[PDB]
Symmetry: D2
Subunit: 283 residues, 4 copies
Amino acid sequence: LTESSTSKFVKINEKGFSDFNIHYNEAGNGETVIMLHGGGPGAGGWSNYYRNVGPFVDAGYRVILKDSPGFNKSDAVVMDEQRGLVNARAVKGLMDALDIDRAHLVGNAMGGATALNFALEYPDRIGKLILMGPGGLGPSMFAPMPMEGIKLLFKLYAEPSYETLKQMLQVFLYDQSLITEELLQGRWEAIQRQPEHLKNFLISAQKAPLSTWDVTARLGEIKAKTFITWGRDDRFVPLDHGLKLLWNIDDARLHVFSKCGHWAQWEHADEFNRLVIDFLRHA
Amino acid sequence: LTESSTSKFVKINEKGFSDFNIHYNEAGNGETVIMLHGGGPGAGGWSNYYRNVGPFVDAGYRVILKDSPGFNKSDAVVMDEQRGLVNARAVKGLMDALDIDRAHLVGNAMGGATALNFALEYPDRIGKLILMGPGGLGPSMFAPMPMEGIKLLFKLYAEPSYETLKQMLQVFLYDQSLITEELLQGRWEAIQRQPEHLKNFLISAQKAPLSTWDVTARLGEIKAKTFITWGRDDRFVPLDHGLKLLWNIDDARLHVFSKCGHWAQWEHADEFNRLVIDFLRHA
Amino acid sequence: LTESSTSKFVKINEKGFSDFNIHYNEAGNGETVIMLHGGGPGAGGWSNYYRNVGPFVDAGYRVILKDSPGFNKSDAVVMDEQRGLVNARAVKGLMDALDIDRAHLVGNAMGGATALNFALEYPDRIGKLILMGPGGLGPSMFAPMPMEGIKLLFKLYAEPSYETLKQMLQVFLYDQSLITEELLQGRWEAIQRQPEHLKNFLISAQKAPLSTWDVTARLGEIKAKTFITWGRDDRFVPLDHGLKLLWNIDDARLHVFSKCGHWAQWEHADEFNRLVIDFLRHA
Amino acid sequence: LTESSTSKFVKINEKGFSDFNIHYNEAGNGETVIMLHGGGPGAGGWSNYYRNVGPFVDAGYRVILKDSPGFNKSDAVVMDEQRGLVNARAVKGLMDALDIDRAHLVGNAMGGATALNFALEYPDRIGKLILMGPGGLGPSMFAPMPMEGIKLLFKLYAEPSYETLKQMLQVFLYDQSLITEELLQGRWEAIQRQPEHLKNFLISAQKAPLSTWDVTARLGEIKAKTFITWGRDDRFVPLDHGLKLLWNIDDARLHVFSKCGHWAQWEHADEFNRLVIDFLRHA
Ligand code: NA
Ligand code: NA
Ligand code: NA
Ligand code: NA
């Protein structure tokens, strides 16, 4: 499987979205699992999940790596509402366009916020819910905010440079030996390729700051069986939010990886794939 | 598999122990996994693990459910050293007697303390390390100590009664509908059958209080790949100790079950078995 | 100052309350400080605060130790709304009746919930806000709930006895040598004297469980300078809620006493009085 | 009081130190309080404590703002042991030279580590112990380490620049409007004035990394009445270490300031002075 061979586009129409172009990468043909990426400059579906797509397809799932609005090859957008909600409407729009009745959701960071909002807004359209360091869940009980990684994400959006990208990735990942030239060049290309996305992210964030993303008060509504992952060493979203989710969602479990930053599905791909596939099959 | 069909005895000889009788329940014939039980009145190997033995044997392991010294059908003993250490010497004595070179250890509560001490004292004799709410790891950062469940454990040791047993089990388990007459009668029988164990546990605890069990300072020595489980709702050992282990052991992961007290392998048997078998096979 | 010499009654009229009798103990004549007691069987203003009234009066304050509705010498009541809110309406009713424009509030446990609700509902009527282990702030990130002490409080309400009272007080206080016959007899008398309050508390709790008291989502509205105290060893309300308040109220500080249960103003009276008087004078 | 009018030098002789020059700023003549500064480039006694010296002297104390070895106007040094311990020997050497029998200690960050080590090594020479975000207390249960601020401290030591200084101070302080030109110029001057201190700090840290400073296991030895302060928003040392100290030192209390970084005595000078003076007078 490659980015090119799996690449697809679909126009969506859903509250606010009109003939809005969504790029996604699709492989497999079984039950649908939609994987949703983080919010850093240059993020996208394939980039975030290329270590996960193969094993999930092998396990029998249809995998859709979705580019959220204002990221990668999806259409540019300026949002005036919290991004998790707007992103979730876009997931529903994609599912309606593709005739998908229910999907399992896997959501990393901003994508975790997207997945939580989808579960809340469209409970009849979700199967299981998988969350990796989801963002926006209000204050931490321990971590000063904005968190270290989030400050870097905003710096890179406002003043993109290869050096600042490297600085962000150093904080993003626990193991520094994972920061290859391939990783750096790929992220830099995605940043260079769509400067409009960077500008629009910042305009959006002024319209709806992260303090407006907090869905904590509604977590008791979630009936989806939920699997929460955290990196012990995540400098972008605080570890205690994994506990927050565990206490507030009816049927959740929490798995924390040691020596792991904000990209658990990539940093601990083998264990992540095994745990999440097991969860989807048997939970 | 039944308690009767799996029951075995072996005499051990290891630092302090001389011709000391250890009862255990054994099934299977593959790689050895020794499961170690908690320290409550009436605890024993079969009692603690009868929901786990079958699936582990099915997966290809030789399972040994060991009765620790001063519990169930093992010999009575008064200990003047911290129980985790004394128990670990007994595990080594069992392994030497049975010609087992290396074992995977699964340790619940007192058994978790036993497993940690074994890993520290005999690093060449352990495979993987699995811990479920291990005891003795010093103070909590959040929970007043002694913890609610531990106060009940000491009350029941000092004044055994069916009513106090029921009170303990109510705190021990999250889901109250798991407290069947079968569970109550079984635990009560084990308590009635060996009053000497109750007396000796209390004498031992005066000689070496729980404050002497803390092995925290040595956790950096552990090289075994480690899987830590906690019940979100554990009233016997504090949740933050799962984080303590995760930060201090080199290669650990932490899995926390929702709606789960101090007997995770029984309260969440299906998910526990799947996760731990996966860990042993693939980690 | 004695309970008898300070005792007063006032009828209040405020949303729902009509000619409702409130008992309080008053001393001093300076700026008003209203102290609000916890929700355990037999609780009352004088009982809860008799170690604080003198020093606060000496410092120049008018101190009002208020009995909340359905406690001590205040009128019996069955509430169908969360108690913090109903109690706060009663504080406003008292203040209107006594021509008090603004009061500093000191609130222990249920009284802390009362004080938070008052600050939210009547921001123009509060000076400073002092909270000692306030209840109802939703789930803990660490403590299984209901907390140990709260289970005992409900047991004692449903089946009042001198033995169960002693059991509660043992959990309520860190230092067991504070549990004198005077303390036990006083609490028992207050329980025996008004059995109707016990019955009504339970009926009220069925109508509006503690899960309905959570005001967390509104904490950002509080503009009062706030001083939060916690007992390190509080088995009734979880320590992490002190952090919750510290992160969510604009201008707060948190003081945690070691060797201290759920009655900080009594267990650590000297340090409490000094800190809170300093806060009122200088903050 | 000014830096110039209070400036003094004394040669110390104590295990390892021989005719070693210590600079300090002294005012007042009552009971001695020695204040100990943090470990950032350009730190010193006067710099760290000039908002505290006056009020403490007014309260009747003799205040000594000590420059630790390898800082400010004290002699340059390369240490091969953990700095808290070496610093504590230097405090004892100062006290012996000045004929001070016992001192109260106030210790910020590295200075907190110094104060803890002094309390452990010389229990007969300390009065009360005051700690503000003390360093070196091992891992956090929540914060990825090295902490954000500590990474910046090492960056500034290795590559001193005015821009990197400003970056550090932005993380050091909660309120950005406290970062005046006066603050920046003062810190920069202290950095420019003694480049040898920067080089030596780095050589020392290679000889004895922060992982060797952890005195956690010995905290039960401390008999000094202890007052612990933390900034809620401290990005240099983790908030949960305040709890660690509170649980492990016999007689401690914890005060946490909101909207406060790693320089609590300066960021919240008025409340800090009042609380600590009250503690020294009455605790
Ligand atoms: Na490699
Ligand atoms: Na059933
Ligand atoms: Na006494
Ligand atoms: Na100003």
